[PDB]
Structure 1
Amino acid sequence: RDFNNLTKGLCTINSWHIYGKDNAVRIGEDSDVLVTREPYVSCDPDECRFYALSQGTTIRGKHSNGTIHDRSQYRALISWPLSSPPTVYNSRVECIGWSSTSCHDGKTRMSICISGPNNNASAVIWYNRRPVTEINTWARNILRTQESECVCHNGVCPVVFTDGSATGPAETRIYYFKEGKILKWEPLAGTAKHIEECSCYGERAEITCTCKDNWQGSNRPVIRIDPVAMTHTSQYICSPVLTDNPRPNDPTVGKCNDPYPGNNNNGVKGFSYLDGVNTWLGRTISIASRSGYEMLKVPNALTDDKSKPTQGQTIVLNTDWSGYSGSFMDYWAEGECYRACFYVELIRGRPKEDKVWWTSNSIVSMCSSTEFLGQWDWPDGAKIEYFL
Structure 2
Amino acid sequence: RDFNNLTKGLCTINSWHIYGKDNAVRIGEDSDVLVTREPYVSCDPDECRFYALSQGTTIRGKHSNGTIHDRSQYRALISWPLSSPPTVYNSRVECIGWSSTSCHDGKTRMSICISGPNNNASAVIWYNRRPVTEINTWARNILRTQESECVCHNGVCPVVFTDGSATGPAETRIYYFKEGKILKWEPLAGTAKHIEECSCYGERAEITCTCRDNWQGSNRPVIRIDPVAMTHTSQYICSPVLTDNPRPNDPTVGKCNDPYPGNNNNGVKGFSYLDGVNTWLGRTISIASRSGYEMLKVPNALTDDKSKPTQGQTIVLNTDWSGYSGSFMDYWAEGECYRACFYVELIRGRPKEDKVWWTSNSIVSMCSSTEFLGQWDWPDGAKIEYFL
TM-score by length of 1: 1.00
Give CA deviations for 1:268-303 in whole Å, capped at 9, x if unaligned.
000000000000000000000000000000000000
- Counterpart Cα distance in 2 of 1:52 and 1:274: 25
- Counterpart Cα distance in 2 of 1:258 and 1:181: 34
Could you say what secondary structure the match of 1:27 adopts?
Answer: helix
1:184 Cα deviation after fit = 0.1
- Counterpart Cα distance in 1 of 2:344 and 2:23: 12
Segments of 4+ moved more than 2 angstroms: none
Aligned to 2:4: 4
1:67 Cα deviation after fit = 0.2
1:357 Cα deviation after fit = 0.0
1:192 Cα deviation after fit = 0.1
Aligned to 2:38: 38
Could you say what secondary structure the match of 2:101 adopts?
Answer: strand
Identity rate, percent: 100
1:48 Cα deviation after fit = 0.0
1:24 Cα deviation after fit = 0.1
Aligned to 2:153: 153
Aligned to 1:233: 233
- Counterpart Cα distance in 2 of 1:231 and 1:70: 32
- Counterpart Cα distance in 1 of 2:218 and 2:71: 25
Give CA deviations for 1:49-99 in whole Å, capped at 9, x if unaligned.
000000000000000000000000000000000000000000000000000
1:316 Cα deviation after fit = 0.0
- Counterpart Cα distance in 1 of 2:191 and 2:54: 35
Aligned to 2:248: 248
State how many pairs are aligned. Answer: 388
Aligned to 1:335: 335
Give CA deviations for 1:90-119 in whole Å, capped at 9, x if unaligned.
000000000000000000000000000000
1:363 Cα deviation after fit = 0.0
Give CA deviations for 1:230-265 in whole Å, capped at 9, x if unaligned.
000000000000000000000000000000000000
Aligned to 2:112: 112
Aligned to 2:376: 376
Could you say what secondary structure the match of 2:139 adopts?
Answer: coil
1:197 Cα deviation after fit = 0.2
Give CA deviations for 1:2-41 in whole Å, capped at 9, x if unaligned.
0000000000000000000000000000000000000000
Q: Which segments of 5 or more consecutive residues in structure 2 lack a partner in the other structure?
A: none
Could you say what secondary structure the match of 2:110 adopts?
Answer: strand
Could you say what secondary structure the match of 2:134 adopts?
Answer: strand
- Counterpart Cα distance in 2 of 1:58 and 1:216: 36
- Counterpart Cα distance in 2 of 1:169 and 1:223: 17
Give CA deviations for 1:165-208 in whole Å, capped at 9, x if unaligned.
00000000000000000000000000000000000000000000
Could you say what secondary structure the match of 2:26 adopts?
Answer: helix
Give CA deviations for 1:305-331 in whole Å, capped at 9, x if unaligned.
000000000000000000000000000
Could you say what secondary structure the match of 1:379 adopts?
Answer: coil
1:130 Cα deviation after fit = 0.0
- Counterpart Cα distance in 1 of 2:350 and 2:168: 27
Give CA deviations for 1:202-230 in whole Å, capped at 9, x if unaligned.
00000000000000000000000000000
1:378 Cα deviation after fit = 0.1
Instruction: Tell me if 1:135 matches 2:159.
Output: no
- Counterpart Cα distance in 1 of 2:338 and 2:280: 15
1:120 Cα deviation after fit = 0.1
Could you say what secondary structure the match of 1:166 adopts?
Answer: coil
Aligned to 1:321: 321
Q: Which segments of 5 or more consecutive residues in structure 1 lack a partner in the other structure?
A: none
1:338 Cα deviation after fit = 0.1
- Counterpart Cα distance in 2 of 1:221 and 1:187: 15
- Counterpart Cα distance in 1 of 2:252 and 2:157: 37
- Counterpart Cα distance in 1 of 2:47 and 2:124: 24
Give CA deviations for 1:125-156 in whole Å, capped at 9, x if unaligned.
00000000000000000000000000000000
Aligned to 2:280: 280
- Counterpart Cα distance in 2 of 1:140 and 1:61: 33
Aligned to 1:362: 362
1:163 Cα deviation after fit = 0.1
Aligned to 1:303: 303
- Counterpart Cα distance in 1 of 2:120 and 2:63: 26
RMSD of aligned residue pairs (Cα, Å)? 0.1
